[PDB]
Subunit: 69 residues, 5 copies
């Protein structure tokens, strides 16, 4: 899957359908994987740099692949 | 959903029906989403500023949407 | 439910039946709610002040309601 | 159950059958309770002193009772 | 099982099939154990030294055994 954005996690949002939105770079993206919820929040809290991989590389787009650096 | 309150998390409470109550701004609110329990506690512990979105914007009211900043 | 004890968590104990015991104030109490295990450990580790609410307010008594301050 | 060892968690090990091994005092012990995995890793990380209770107080022996101090 | 690599966790990656990849030493490896996801991310965040034990000791190989030092 292609790289989409890389950056620190500007903010996260828990959504009304139990998905989890994230803002990284200039993109707001979401993931239906519940596993990623607390990893992403930890990244946000500790100031990790993450890379998100997705073909739906647009605001509102979905993702499931993330790299924690 | 409309913004309801924004602030740091004043306190949380685990309830007898496994719901989780949170005090943010001047509102005490609850969420039946189990997934939010540890996110909300981490936010509380680290001093994050959260925004809760809900149409039931009164003490005792329910929520599922939260933004972690 | 009435207040039972208020204090920092002196120590916790994982029990052989997968319940979790906590010492707060002068009381040892337990909870069969798995969700509370890591919340109570976190409170212990970070020195949070908790309040436990239970009508079984004696050593060995059960609880499910906790306030995290 | 009798006390078996007391000390800081020298190391943990995740095992091929999803059990979790821990080195405390002079004993290596394991637990088949999944709930304890992240508690024991948090105790290791923050330098908590634990006591493990078990009748199988020998290397390789099993446990489910832990006290977090 | 034989030792494979030892080191700090250079990066992790959540994969599209809910497995978790990890870079330690000169090897990129994955595990299908969901339990290990947040343990390995904690090790990464806190700068723990891990050892991975696997007979598939090449890039892209699988593991389930980790030692946290
Ligand atoms: C005032 C003293 O009494 C109480 O405070 N009682 C609290 C308990 C009863 N709670 C309750 O009924 O919650 C459900 C109704 O509340 C949810 C609210 O529903 C809206 C509905 O969607 C609207 O279209 C309609 O006009 O009215 C009601 C209320 O204004 O919606 C909000 C979000 O917009 C909450 O739902 C969210 O939280 C709960 C709990 O976490 C639940 O998951 C929902 O799935 C989630 O959306 C209110 O609870
Ligand atoms: O031999 C067991 C196996 O033991 C594991 C152990 O859990 C770890 O400490 C170690 O590192 O790896 C050893 C070697 O395998 O555990 C599995 C299940 O988790 C099997 O255990 C069951 O088998 C027995 C037959 O009844 C007995 O009841 C065990 O106590 C069961 O749990 C395997 O046989
Ligand atoms: O392919 C497996 C690997 O299989 C071994 C098998 O263990 C040997 O007895 C055989 O002779 O050699 C094959 C090939 O290496 O087992 C390794 C660890 O020894 C990996 O297996 C683990 O990883 C998997 C995905 O993480 C899954 O968790 C397995 O259950 C683990 O055993 C490798 O993938
Ligand atoms: O028996 C349960 C409960 O019933 C009554 O309260 C009702 C709702 O439960 C309560 O949420 C609601 O609160 C109102 C405030 O009073 C109102 O001023 C504010 O604008 O919003 C909320 C919700 O719309 O009130 C109703 C009844 O009007 C009972 O009154 C209460 O004691 C409690 O027993
Ligand atoms: O976590 C793994 C395992 O831990 C606990 O069991 C311990 C040993 O695994 C087990 O073999 C041991 O059996 C005891 C009996 O209780 C006792 O009656 C008998 O006489 O002696 C044996 C061997 O010494 O018990 C210990 C701790 O008491 C846990 O209870 C168990 O379910 C399992 O998780
Ligand atoms: O410490 C908490 C808990 O962990 C251990 O059980 C594990 C999971 O927590 C549990 O939900 C899971 O149960 C399996 C059943 O064994 C199986 O019959 C069914 O088909 O699938 C479920 C859902 O996965 O199993 C694991 C352990 O294999 C621990 O043994 C348990 O008693 C308790 O302490
Ligand atoms: O919290 C999760 C769930 O765990 C188990 C208990 O028996 C329940 O009553 C409930 O707590």
């Amino acid at each position: 899957t292609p790289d989409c954005v890389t950056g620190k996690v500007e903010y996260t949002k828990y959504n009304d359908d139990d998905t989890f939105t994230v803002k990284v770079g200039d993109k707001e993206l979401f993931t239906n994987r519940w596993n990623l919820q607390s990893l992403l929040l930890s990244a946000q809290i500790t100031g990790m740099t993450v890379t998100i991989k997705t073909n739906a590389c647009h605001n509102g787009g979905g993702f499931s692949e993330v790299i924690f650096r």
